[PDB]
Design a protein around this ligand. Structure first.
Ligand SMILES: NC(=O)c1ccc[n+]([C@@H]2O[C@H](COP(=O)([O-])OP(=O)(O)OC[C@H]3O[C@@H](n4cnc5c(N)ncnc54)[C@H](OP(=O)(O)O)[C@@H]3O)[C@@H](O)[C@H]2O)c1
Ligand SMILES: NC(=O)c1ccc[n+]([C@@H]2O[C@H](COP(=O)([O-])OP(=O)(O)OC[C@H]3O[C@@H](n4cnc5c(N)ncnc54)[C@H](OP(=O)(O)O)[C@@H]3O)[C@@H](O)[C@H]2O)c1
Lengths: 314, 314
């Protein structure tokens, strides 16, 4: 069995990967909570790698937040993510861990990228300011992996998810992430019998959403590809793989779907006196599809199962 | 007196800053060699800051090299520079050091940047591959400074030098840095009585060169500006300041000048069957000039004094 360390296993993404692997008789999971191992502490991280015989690492630990958190604590987001990534990568290398999967984010891409965004859009223009600090730390993570691959012949791969939703999300109505926010807002609206729910903007912008269990399955799929196959479909200094659906959805279609899924009978209302973001943002997932992975969970199905998970965990 | 820690003080840039400050009765220098303090060791760096009452830091320590070194050891260049920067910045903050000057490099800029390159070119396109790893670590350094400035109201400023030359450079004929390389090549050619020296390319590309003592004076100048003045001439998320001459020189003019400076009487020869780089690369130094600093050392004068330093230190 392969000994697989999923950093950040109690996280949204980490716990999705754990649920899938825990069904694998060919895998032994090695897991440490934050209390047991602070991944900011280089010495602790090296001690763990030196004593635990790891074969593969899924790097799913990170300082994460929404718009307010990213603009309010920028130092926390660049420092902590640079240090977690640096410590784990360095320790992995030092202890002969050859396989690693780094989980980044689509925030890496330029604000005005060409759509849909191919992996080659990386570094082609200015970042969104709200996410700039975290985005630079995640690009540094990808370039750490690439650099160790190139200097030492490592196999440290990377995926960049689109917007994710599903179990273990933060279902507060003030989350800036639209799916959990709206699930919770429509849930409460449905409880109060509120006549309407008002969403800022016209509803016209197009966005992309992937269920976290699809993310986890794609991530495992990418981790487990033959190296020769992964190499044929990437480039040493352009090595990351976008993970998503590659399909747009309007915020209007999303909000009307969530209303249906929760059984809301009032009105979804869009207040177009508020600004819209860009008209379209989504990943080009041609590389992942060429590597033989396609998502399985439709928005409708994913929303319904996610909402059921929230009901069970209120 | 202000207690000033110059990280990397025995380096080319660090030692230039030290020579200038050591003439300041208002400054007490705090210096630690690599052997005394390994800046990769977070615990050691924090212990130093916690016991040494520092007021200002000049961050002039880095893993540095030429074209071969950067392409051969990419992991070393991204990892080491990320960790030195992260450790010093974090420790400074933690111990109430309010003033810091981070020394980056013009390698940060896109390969196809608009010339001359204004600070706003940062992040506008693809990096030169040879330097990509180091460049991402230095951009992460600038964004660490910005992030601490914005979250905690720190005063962590940054300068990006152009190509530098002067005392304490590496004067081996195989240095990929053209000034020390050519000084040493013409020096040897002059000793051997070699009939010619052949330089690859046509000589037409334009490049920018600044003497290291000018860099040091500009760096001190930028460190010491009133915060209100520095703020008026920068932007929180676009805070770095280019340091250079803002003036182009052909590689042909450079090589013919070096030949004159060393007293070579053979021929400078350009072999145009080898490729040239881009036609022009230089910094726009309007922000530094607006902040009231202008370089003092002409290329001719700088070359002559640099060569005299090499003669004295062979
Ligand atoms: N929609 C999404 O969820 C989404 C979208 C795009 C990309 N991603 C990428 O996926 C990665 C994981 O996202 P996520 O939402 O799954 O995060 P989470 O799931 O909210 O948290 C991941 C976790 O890693 C842990 N961690 C952070 N710092 C640690 C430390 N110093 N020591 C040990 N553990 C530490 C956290 O610990 P403590 O939580 O207990 O604080 C947290 O449990 C992120 O890098 C994110 O950018 C996620
Ligand atoms: N032409 C130029 O020189 C030039 C141009 C553009 C930008 N810059 C920027 O200026 C900065 C300094 O450049 P430079 O040429 O002055 O470098 P140097 O002068 O060649 O070396 C700087 C030094 O900092 C030290 N250092 C590195 N790692 C350390 C560690 N782990 N612990 C303690 N000290 C450490 C080095 O120690 P050990 O040397 O003894 O290994 C070295 O003495 C760099 O970031 C460079 O990118 C320089």
């Amino acid at each position: 069995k392969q000994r697989v360390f999923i950093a950040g296993h109690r996280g949204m993404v980490g716990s999705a990967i754990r649920r899938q692997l825990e069904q694998r008789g060919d895998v032994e999971l090695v897991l440490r909570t934050r209390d047991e191992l602070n991944l900011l502490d280089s010495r602790a991280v090296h001690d763990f790698f030196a004593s635990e015989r790891i074969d593969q690492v899924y790097l799913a630990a990170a300082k994460v937040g929404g718009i307010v958190a990213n603009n309010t604590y920028p130092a926390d987001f660049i420092y902590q993510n640079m240090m977690i990534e640096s410590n784990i990568i360095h320790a992995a290398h030092q202890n002969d861990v050859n396989k690693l999967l780094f989980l980044g984010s689509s925030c890496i891409y330029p604000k005005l990228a060409k759509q849909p965004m191919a992996e080659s859009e990386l570094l082609q223009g200015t970042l969104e300011p709200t996410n700039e600090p975290e985005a630079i730390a995640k690009i540094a993570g990808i370039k750490l992996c690439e650099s160790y691959n190139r200097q030492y012949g490592r196999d440290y791969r990377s995926v960049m998810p689109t917007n994710l939703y599903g179990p273990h999300d933060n279902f507060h109505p003030s989350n800036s992430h639209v799916i959990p926010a709206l699930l919770r807002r429509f849930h409460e609206a449905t409880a109060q019998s509120a006549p309407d729910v008002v969403v800022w903007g016209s509803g016209t912008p197009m966005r992309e959403f992937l269920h976290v269990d699809d993310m986890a399955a794609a991530s495992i799929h990418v981790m487990e590809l033959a190296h020769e196959v992964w190499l044929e479909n990437t480039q040493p200094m352009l090595s990351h793989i976008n993970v998503g659906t590659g399909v747009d959805c309007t915020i209007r279609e999303l909000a009307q779907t969530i209303a249906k899924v929760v059984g809301y009978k009032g009105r979804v209302v869009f207040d177009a006196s508020k600004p819209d973001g860009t008209p379209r943002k989504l990943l080009d997932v041609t590389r992942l599809h060429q590597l033989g992975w396609y998502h399985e969970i439709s928005l409708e199905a994913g929303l319904a199962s996610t909402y059921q998970w929230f009901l069970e965990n209120q």
